[PDB]
Symmetry: C3
Subunit: 283 residues, 3 copies
């Protein structure tokens, strides 16, 4: 297994797959609650998607053609799946943390669940303001998430290779800072152009609601490096058992609040601001 | 390997990769026949694709721009690859069932071969009638297939974890029933609108051929849960050796018959029904 | 591990992951140089992409909407990542050749790094001439690369299964010959139509530069089967230590020269040839 040491590493193997769970009761309860709320948000958003009329309220299957409107749905849907298998683990009492086979887009690994969620989510949110460079942000966050997965892989491995985890941490943090700066800049410029093009709208309160939602949604990603630093992978100011509840509340804020905000926006928007958004998505 | 038991599980490991095959002569012959017919259907469909003129029969490389017309080709092509490696296993006499490394889109695992085939196939068939919600059905079937792969992973594992296989079976069956119901509903509504918009067509017999093909193609997926139930993973009314021939005949019906039906449709369709399909794909 | 033999195979396992490196100083230096030049080319191309004006030189974020112009960027970007982890291995002195977990699009395996690079690269280059059958070439090269990965998997395995490596070699070479022939034919026909439609251009020297670039770029892929034949996987006229430098120079020619050629083309093209390319992309 390892040279010079009789200890063996169970990460990425079926041997660690059959090990008993290292979680406690509160982690299982948090997983259950997160799965329940993800499922009910997915059901509610799908119910709204089935009864989703167009802006003119006469087009029947508007979501059937403008399928990107349902895009967040899929992400939220996958989030439910991203936890459902863990619930199965919570049923069986066996180890599930970074063990077993590696499959893209599943919650069997800590950061690999975000492969199909995070780039689509950021693409959808910047598409809602018709911001340019749609593919670029998704590619950047995909690369950062892959770096995070590989850093977590080095974290559990041989302690002689512990130094690479900090290097990949620095890599991911540098690209995340760059991505956050560029997305904040483009969002600020785009919404400034929208505001200077927002004359005689009649939805100023709705405009305030949407600007508050998008600014909070842009600034929410400050959780990831703080959470990584406070867990034992970084400075270790918290223990492992309280990391799972943190990840649950963070990705609930990321997904369910996003779905609720989009649902509340779609029941209050009007058509002239819509056509001004299409006008904005030109230059 | 496993606590309390000296037995070891060879699934997902190189140890089970080097094991001798568990198949018999008839399974090898069925694999050979299925690979041969898949290869000849792929060759025939590619030959038709090279000599594929437009509806006006003057556009030379119509398939070169409307590349989605070749889409089924790719699926059928991958199906050939999906069996070709198994033929190599049939050459070497070593174990190939759910062993070795896991790679997306290959036939080394029982259900993982359908990753690149089934969503593209369903998208192509519902696109042929210009049905809405194109991405949604593909995402649903992708999630169901991933659930099936993971259920098959639990099936071979530790018998103390056998209960999760039935839970994932219920999950996959519930979402498959939902998908089948919604796709049947949308197909029925879409073709009802086509029929009430099909006046003075001149291709009523061709219309009967295409409706028979699409209805049979919509109802063919009843094979999957019945096949899973009759094999030892479910009720076990059949043995393992006769499961491979069942999967061969089922995916041949799924792919080669689809290609033959599309080829026969493209040599008999006319242009006014074509433009009425574009008219249908509006509301 | 293996029946009848006490030897064990370290491929695809964490046991071979923790093994010491089999590389020497020159391989590490070549990896460092290749990573450095890939990083600087990515930085330069990103700097050009940020300051990328439209053909009329008044559209500010032309790349923000015509995002496919940045497509090669992403490939080159991934190439940097495709080597960066190897640099980490070169830091740690542990084995990295075809060991550890298998992840799509990474350089941990010899041919798996090209999953996200080669089809996008060929799609971008044939899109630059507006050639038809865009998806088909990408699918063909994806299948060939997957076959190469699996052949390399058989190469390291049990010597009783060495015969399958030659079969997959023949498969990959046959499909590569077919792909090369068809891409050469379509490129020749397309550029012949461009030349017979190139009247009063004013950029004949620029036309010569671009034709030389595209012909060299079309003929560069002759490196892959020659490199595979000369390494010990084939005829073995060279040793393992000199294969890494060959792969470095080959993929540098594939990626950095492509980026430099595209950058030099974008600083010299004019608008009438541009609109003639859009006219060409019709029939």
């Amino acid at each position: 297994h390892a040279p010079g040491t009789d200890q063996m590493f169970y990460v990425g193997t079926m041997d660690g797959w059959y090990l008993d769970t290292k979680l406690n009761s509160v982690a299982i309860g948090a997983h259950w609650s997160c799965f329940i709320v993800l499922t009910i948000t997915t059901f509610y958003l799908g119910y709204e998607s089935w009864t989703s009329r167009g802006p003119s309220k006469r087009t029947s299957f508007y979501a059937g053609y403008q399928e990107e409107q349902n895009l967040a749905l899929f992400v939220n849907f996958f989030a439910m799946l991203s936890y459902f298998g863990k619930i199965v683990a919570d049923t069986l009492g066996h180890n599930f943390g970074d063990v077993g086979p590696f499959i893209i887009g599943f919650g069997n690994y800590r950061y690999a669940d975000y492969m199909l969620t995070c780039p689509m989510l950021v693409y959808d949110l910047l598409y809602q303001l018709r911001a340019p460079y749609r593919v670029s942000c998704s590619a950047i966050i995909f690369a950062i998430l892959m770096s995070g997965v590989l850093a977590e892989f080095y974290a559990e491995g041989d302690p002689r290779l512990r130094n690479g985890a900090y290097a990949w941490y620095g890599f991911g943090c540098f690209w995340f800072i760059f991505a956050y700066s560029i997305v904040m800049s483009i969002v600020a410029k785009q919404y400034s152009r929208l505001a200077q093009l927002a004359q005689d709208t009649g939805a100023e309160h709705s405009l305030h609601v949407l600007k508050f939602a998008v600014f909070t949604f842009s600034m929410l990603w400050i959780l990831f490096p703080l959470v990584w630093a406070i867990c034992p992978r970084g400075f270790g100011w918290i223990d492992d058992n309280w990391t799972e509840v943190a990840h649950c509340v963070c990705d609930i804020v990321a997904k369910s609040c996003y779905g609720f905000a989009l649902a509340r926006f779609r029941k209050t928007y009007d058509e002239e601001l819509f056509r001004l958004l299409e006008q904005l998505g030109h230059d």
